[model samples]
Target: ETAWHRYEKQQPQCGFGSAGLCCRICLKGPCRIDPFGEGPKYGVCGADRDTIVARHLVRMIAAGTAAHSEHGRHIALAMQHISQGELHDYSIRDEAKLYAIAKTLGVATEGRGLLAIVGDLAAITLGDFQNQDYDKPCAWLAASLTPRRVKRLGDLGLLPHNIDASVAQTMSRTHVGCDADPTNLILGGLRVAMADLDGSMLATELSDALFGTPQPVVSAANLGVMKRGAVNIAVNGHNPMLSDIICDVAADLRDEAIAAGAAEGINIIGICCTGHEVMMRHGVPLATNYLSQELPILTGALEAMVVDVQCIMPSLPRIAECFHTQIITTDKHNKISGATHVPFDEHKAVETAKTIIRMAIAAFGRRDPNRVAIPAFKQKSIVGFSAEAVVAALAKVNADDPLKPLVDNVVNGNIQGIVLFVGCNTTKVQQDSAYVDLAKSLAKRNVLVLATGCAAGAFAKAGLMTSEATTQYAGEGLKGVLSAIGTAAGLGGPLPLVMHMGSCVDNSRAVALATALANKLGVDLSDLPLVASAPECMSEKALAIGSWAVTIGLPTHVGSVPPVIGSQIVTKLVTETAKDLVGGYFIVDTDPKSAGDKLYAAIQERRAGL
Candidate 1:
């Protein structure tokens, strides 16, 4: 069954839990506060709605921060191993990015070997997570943020010293009976969110240095990309370290798959962010995204569905049982109950990848012809719009001054503003409907749309990431700019309406582009005419992403009301008071048309400030 069907089975979920009115932080009681005044107003620990709501929200921020930061830690460790010549599976693929990042870290790269510089860089990065000194800020946060932003975050004491320490402290503070003050608790959440941002930056930049930064490429999306006659393997999850190796190993074993009764040989497709990663770099077709991940397996042609970490449904193994598909879990920390555990080691990358591919080839022999039903739906897409790629595309129009063309367009009101489409697909909302409607609305107003994560997948699947979308949805002036860039970049038609930025962790790519724009304008990020919207946000990762988007001085919109609405005081602090303090705030609207209007209005307001 699809996640949508399972969600229907849930019928009515708990109202108190949904509203953040329930608290189970301690053994004192699994207490819940009533929304109406007639019911219980306080928990056993004397925690009211405000305290309970704020505490719960802060804890989510902590968990989300931990999730992203831990992913960063793993990447950092991989970089360290590569520097020491310990990881045989990976090497520095983007030497230019390596040098650039090293320079930013203030490491002496001038007369040094790449490995030596990489080792020093890895050491400094690891310090950001392990450093115990509260007085010191995270290396990435200190090095990457704009000067004015740094000053503002520092003055407000929202800067994170150590990534791990900040997350740990947030968890400790949100414990029941402690940090009962609602305002203070929310502020603590902001601090953790900042750490999450820092972690995101580290993960994206370092990964680029290891696995070359993405550039413009052509790819396709949706389940129809899966070949019916091939030995199809779907790679799902966030990390690309293992998946990249698997793609390489798949090519080496292609002849073997062809030999094993598979006429089309090996076909490797992507499912979630991991699919996004390879899709950008290698033009790998994406089979599906978050909510519909199981649907690809239901196609029955998939020989194996391999997952690493994050956004992977636990129900995947259960769903795979209906077919001959082998659900493979690679991460030691995230083994599913029935999925085959194939521990992936960077030291033995080739062997592990070969083993996994061999497993898929073996499973290909057991394919049930009666169950095979590959969907005949796919969309042609041009993706891989990294910050560098964006600049390169703009440079085609204004060779000597890339940002000038974009800035000039925004200044002249030809391009209304920039809106970042972010977040995931939740069962709480109709899959892909919200993103499709909201994007078309904003694009029609001449606002530039930049998408990442599952939002990008939605646009790709909906055919919004094609030249046809520019003609159909984009306003006249915006269409002119896109056409100019497209023609100059050798694209036969206008650029896609929504540019795919990358996966969830790669949201840092958008921040890099925004930082560049802010720097060029001689102003803070808040002064730019930019906004972020998560129309179907679900995960704590999305919450952390939206929180940092606000903290970084961009007005953010979420279509689903976050859990904070249960407490008016806490909700006001996030949606209203936050604007005064951080120059960013949240707008919650469930209606797509209204949400689109609200986001465009926010863009217009920022335009006025500019």
Candidate 2:
């Protein structure tokens, strides 16, 4: 059964829990406030509904911040290990990116050896997690923010000194009696959210330096990417370090798989953000994403499902039990009860990868022919549009001034505005329905849609990442610009209505593009005609992402009402007071049509301000 069916089985979940009215943070009591104004409004410790709601929301931000920042820490440590020659399995793939990033970090790269520069840069990045000085902000946040934005954030004391420390303090402040003020706690959440953004920036930029930055690439999406006869392995999760090594080792072991009775040898497919990372950079076909992750195993052709971390359902092992598929967990922290644990080590990447592939090949021999049922629903998709790739494509239209063409189009109303689709799939909503409805609505109105994470996967699976989507959904003016640029870039047709940027952490790619636009226009990011929407957001990581999107001056929309709505004061602070204070706010709407209308109106409001 899919997650949808499982969700249905969980009918009538706790009303208090769903409404953010329950608190179990301490042993004092697992208290809850009655929303109907008929029962006790205060908890056992005299905590009101506002305090309960704000504390819950802030804790979610902390958890989300921890998830993203921890991912960044792993990538940073990997780079550090590579610089010291401790990790022989990986090396710098993009020297240009390293040099550029080093310059931004204030490391002197001139006349310096690559390892020496890399070592210094790694140390600087590590400091962002370890630094204790309050006056000194995170290296990435300080280096990346606009001068005005830096000043504004600094003035409000929202600048994070250390990524991990900020997350720690957020947890401490949200504990029962501490930080009772709703507004103060909300601001603390914003501070932690900014750290999440800093971590995201470091992880994405450093990852590009290690594994070459993404460019335009053609790939396929959906469960049909799996082969009935091949030794099929699906890589799911957020980290690409292990998956990249698996791809390399799979190629080396392809002959062995074929010799073992498989006609097509080995076929590796991606699922979730990790799949997105490899698909964008290496043209690996995506098998599935998020909610539909288990559907691949149901096809019975998948030999193994390999996972690293983040967005992996624990139910995956149970699903694989019904098939011949072997669920393999690679991360040391993410071992499953029934799944095989093959711990991933950067030092022995190739060896570990070979072992995992061999396991899949063994599982392939035990496959039941009668159970095989691969879906034929894959679609051709053109992905890997990084900030650099975007500029290069625009440069084709305006040789000397790449940003000029895009800016001119926006100014002339050919492109209404840009909306970034970022988040995961929640069973609270129909799998991918919200994303498709919102994208089509926005694109039909001349808005450029950029997607990341599972939202990108949704568009890819629905065939919105094709030239036909642009022809069918894009407005005339938007279609004209896309056609001119795509043809000039040698794509042979118009660009897709939805451009897949990358994974969840790669949301910074959109920020980089926005910062460039802001720089050229000599305005803050808040003044730009840009917006972000998370139609089916569920994870704490998605909450942190949306929080930072608002903090960085983009009016963000979340289709599901956030937990803080239980407290009117906290909800008002986030949806109203935030706009006045930070120039960005949250739009909470469940209906796709109404959400689309609100987003379009927001774009127009920002355009008027610009």
Candidate 3:
């Protein structure tokens, strides 16, 4: 049998997996009660399959939302600490981006100083989702439909205080009978999810204002890039602060490596969203996603894998022992057995990064040359497409007019449609064939496909995002529009048209863009020629993001797999009812061609109505 088959047979209790029924929330029960069984007597609580599944599914969304909000909370604390000079290593990277966010959150900048404006924005960030009056300027009311009482929970604390507490409370409440009502469970999820909105917006503004927005730059990923005869360190996980320090220290270590005769330079790379930050800003190669975490150690060339938070995969330490790889833990919340614990502090990030890099460089000679097996499938990609960069590109085409050629095309009925294909990578689906087929299909129909996360990676790695090939795929109308704008003035490639906004949190960038397009076209977001999708998604975080996008009037498509199939109420709520409330709908399509066709048709229908 295959590895998964062997593993599955070892624990036949997982039989419910095939039926999508498994709940492991509290220690009381790791329940797997089948719905299509004889006179159901499943859990201690006597919850049916539909009840149990909906609760489990909704709770996952709650946890995922909480994770993102916690991230935002940390960012807020870092920003406040920087403002007060409590953190010497941290500083605002993007000022104009900050101002732009301030404008969105309705922060008046007429005569305000930076700190004063930020301080006010910070409070709003915490309170925006929790506020009840519904008319609060920056409350992001359009993104949520929850009542005032729950929104107030976010207002009680700054960052570490409010977000951390909310997450703990939500998890505690999800235990068995704690918050059983479907509506209440969903509300709890919303409260935690919206907390991230304020803090994320804050971080994005701060990033743009200080670092300047990212433009298309080259980077690589996977184990093939891990080099021999070099000081190789992998920066894994989210948190850009850790990534920034690692990149800086890697540069310093490169010089040290040259001096020490340890090859030509130091190779600093990472995986997942954290890698994207380094790649976009510093042009560092990645080591694939969560699934590829152990692939580097199999190569036995990596000196250290420095991880911050999210998707560390606890099995890494055991797997690393088979080779000379040293697994390093950088986050306080995440820990693994037998891994070197570093306990990263943003206050002394630069020092910690330097120390870690030095350690890895010193251990370079210890790598087992015979055990290494670096694959040869690595490819070059032009990444680093931020929302601000997209705006700038559009500005050049319209020049002194934000709505003429770009927004006006969709508004004045010139273009065909727009599609925001975004979500996580899934093991259930093929590598990237689905996304490529979908993108190619959409391009032929003259649809603009804006993508993020793995979807963006798929197209970029396939070279479909290149300037030359994209024009060839474009329909006559889109091709003509590009020709009129000139090569420089027109959208360059799939990279430019697809637009890599940033890590998952920056999905909001897509939402913001949709709103801008709608407002510019004098229509609501639901009426705009836009839709989103997840041809291959496997993360709970993807669900929360998809939900929020739908709330904000972006119809979302997903691969066919319903978590709560027994509850048509929940299914209908997500697929149909929510659409009427927020002006967006959801679909589950497994076939790539069918999914692409549905997305195209939806965009065309919306555009035609407009």
Residue runs of model 1 more than 4 Å from their true location after superposition: none
Clashing pairs in 1: none
Across 438-555, the per-residue lDDT of candidate 1 in tens digits comes to 9989988999999999999999899999987898889998888987888789666888999999988889899989998888888888888889999999888899999999999999
All candidates: TM-score: 0.99, 0.99, 0.86
RMSD per model, one decimal: 1.0, 1.0, 4.6
Across residues 1-610, which tens digit of lDDT does each residue of candidate 3 receive? Answer: 2323334576654446544466766676766765556644466676556566666666666666666666666666665665566777766666666766577556788876776666666666656434444333335433322233223333422112244455566677776777776555554554555545544555555555444567666666556777776777887777777877777767766568866556757887677767766776667876665445666776777888888878567777877777777888988788888998987877888888887877787767677767777788676665666665666666767668754677756554445777776666665666676877888788777776677666666665565555554567767665555444435443343333344566666666666666565556566677777788888776777776776566556678887464766556666766776666456667778899989888888887786775
lDDT of model 1 at position 205: 88
Best by lDDT: 2
Rank order (by lDDT, best first): 2, 1, 3
Model 2 agreement with the true structure over 199-309: per-residue lDDT tens digits? 999999998998899999889999898897789999999888889888889989967899888898899999989999999999899987799999888888999999999
Better of 2 and 3 by lDDT: 2
